[PDB]
Amino acid sequence: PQITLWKRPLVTIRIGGQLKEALLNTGADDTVLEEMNLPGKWKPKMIGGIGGFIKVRQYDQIPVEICGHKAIGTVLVGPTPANIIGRNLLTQIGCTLNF
Amino acid sequence: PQITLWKRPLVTIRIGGQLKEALLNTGADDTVLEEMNLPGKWKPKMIGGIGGFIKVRQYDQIPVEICGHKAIGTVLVGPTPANIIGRNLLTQIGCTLNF
């Protein structure tokens, strides 16, 4: 699909058997989702941005469906102001920037 | 050009004669640049991200060249770790997301 940037680039993702709204963010290395319960063991990690750092739970090899395209990788969960799909999963669905 | 996301999407920008590297951020509403002394009036603003908020200065109608593409718009200047080109300017250079 071709997505313009007049509005926030939000899409629907299926994390397990759960639908969520997420922002395609090329300015993020990682994928961070609001606090939610996920299966598996998680390691505490720390990620930062504007404003500073926050502590998050890391989950590996998690399946995520982004607008129909399947991906499997790392997902961080924590006090993020918004759900964001980072470059770790965007590359998996062959997403690129063009202009 | 087509930009992949294997690495951070850093490009060269021309602001007021000085050239710097900026991150193409679809996850940013605004364009935030590292501290610099631009001419003109500016209103104080608060922008938020992952670790909270930071105060920045807002300048309007600022000329900026992104990899050879001329654009003009609002530019926030504050203590940001990196230079960020938000959607306000990306919609001006025809930048889209594709997959």
Binding site: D30, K45, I47 | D30, G48, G49
Partner: peptide, 8 residues
Amino acid sequence: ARVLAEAM
């Protein structure tokens, strides 16, 4: 406004 830049 939100600038969701992020890095680990």
